Amino acid sequence: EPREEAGALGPAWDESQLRSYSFPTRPIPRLSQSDPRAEELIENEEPVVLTDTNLVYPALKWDLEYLQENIGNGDFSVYSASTHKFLYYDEKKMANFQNFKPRSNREEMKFHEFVEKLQDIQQRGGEERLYLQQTLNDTVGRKIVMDFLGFNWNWINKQQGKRGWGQLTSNLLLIGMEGNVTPAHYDEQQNFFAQIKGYKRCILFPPDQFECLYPYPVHHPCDRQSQVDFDNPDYERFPNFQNVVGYETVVGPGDVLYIPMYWWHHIESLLNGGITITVNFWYKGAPTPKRIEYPLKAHQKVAIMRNIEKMLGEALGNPQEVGPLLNTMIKGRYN
């Protein structure tokens, strides 16, 4: 249920701001960084919302006005779409599938241009949607650098060490409009998802629900994204989606959600909730141990399936032939 803001300022959100879907869920635990149960969840690669890390405490003051003045004059990737769904697609893989035409259009612009184009839309009441997704880099201004350095690196660096993870891969700056949705997908890296402004509903599915969520082929641009339209699921093509069960939570300013590697997640900025701001923290996972302990974990089987698809594309000399060969291998032999 919804949490209550301090100072009797009422519920920060209410259930009417959540989109409706076909599957059940149960809540992700919301715990203190000092709670041993929170450490055991992260250790066991299960999601947990940490409420008091102060991970991005300096960034809680961030809003569009502050950022525009201080984030510098670098280029920012801004996506546009006529729908609320911002399906991610790999442009490098767009050669393998010349019949894929994305629904989101990426435009590279300056931050003040992003703010203005957002102002125009709001002014003219248009229905176009924007999502700014840009990796933080050197080009940011001095005050953002100061904020960045003020993150709680003491806490997250200990997490990185305790879990044996690799190095910090990148921080993504995410600024979306109310109602924006990132469809279900999984990432190959560990993720601390640090909410700054507004509220995001996060729905996670463990890696052992691969069978229910039907990722695209590895060579398709939407590799790692679910083929299922959560708003109109085709149960004839995706029958096991009827068995999908999620882990759900709403993160607000100051919350950090641990999204373990290979865990599916569906992320939506609450309806009529204003703009949302997030910074994520992506780390390479721990190295695979020399002695493989059976039985394998679900995410290890996912990794095997990915490797098979990759190698089959290399060996055949064309990713389009992967499907036919795989069918030939199984029809009447393993099904």
Ligand X SMILES: CCC[C@@H](CC(=O)O)C(=O)C(=O)O
Contact footprint for ligand X (CB under 6 A): 133, 172, 174, 182, 187, 191, 193, 259, 265, 267, 278, 280
Residue 312 binding a copy of itself, by CB under 8 A: yes
**Structure tokens belonging to residue 75:** 């280029």
Cβ atoms within 10 Å of 313's Cβ, excluding its own: 18
Q: In sequence order, what are the beta bridge partners of 62?
A: none
The Cα 293–Cα 127 span in angstroms is 52
30 marked ligand binding residue: no
Stretch that binds a copy of itself, among 151-159, 247-255, 271-279, 319-327 (CB under 8 A): 319-327
Closer residue to ligand X (CB): 190 or 322: 190
138 marked ligand binding residue: yes
Stretch that binds a copy of itself, among 21-29, 127-135, 248-256, 287-295 (CB under 8 A): 287-295
**Residue 47 · residue 27 · CB < 8 Å:** no
Stretch that binds a copy of itself, among 14-22, 89-97, 260-268, 300-308 (CB under 8 A): 300-308
- The phi-psi region of residue 283 (left if phi > 0; otherwise alpha if psi is between -120 and 50; otherwise beta) is beta
**Residue 190 · residue 166 · CB < 8 Å:** no
Residue 317 binding a copy of itself, by CB under 8 A: yes
Give the number of residues in contact with Zn ion, rule: CB under 5 A: 1
In angstroms, give the least distance from the CB of 99 to Zn ion. 25
11 SS3 class:
strand
Residue 330 binding a copy of itself, by CB under 8 A: yes
The Cα 68–Cα 168 span in angstroms is 26
224 marked ligand binding residue: yes
**Structure tokens belonging to residue 171:** 């921080």
Q: To which H or E segment does residue 129 belong? A: strand 129-135
Which candidate, 142, 139, 156, places its Cα nearest to that of 281? 156
Give the number of residues in contact with a copy of itself, rule: CB under 8 A: 38
Closer residue to a copy of itself (CB): 245 or 311: 311
Choose from Zn ion, ligand X, a copy of itself, none: what does 193 bind? Cβ within 5-8 Å by kind.
ligand X
Choose from ligand X, a copy of itself, Zn ion, none: what does 96 bind? Cβ within 5-8 Å by kind.
none
Interface residues with Zn ion (CB under 5 A) are 187
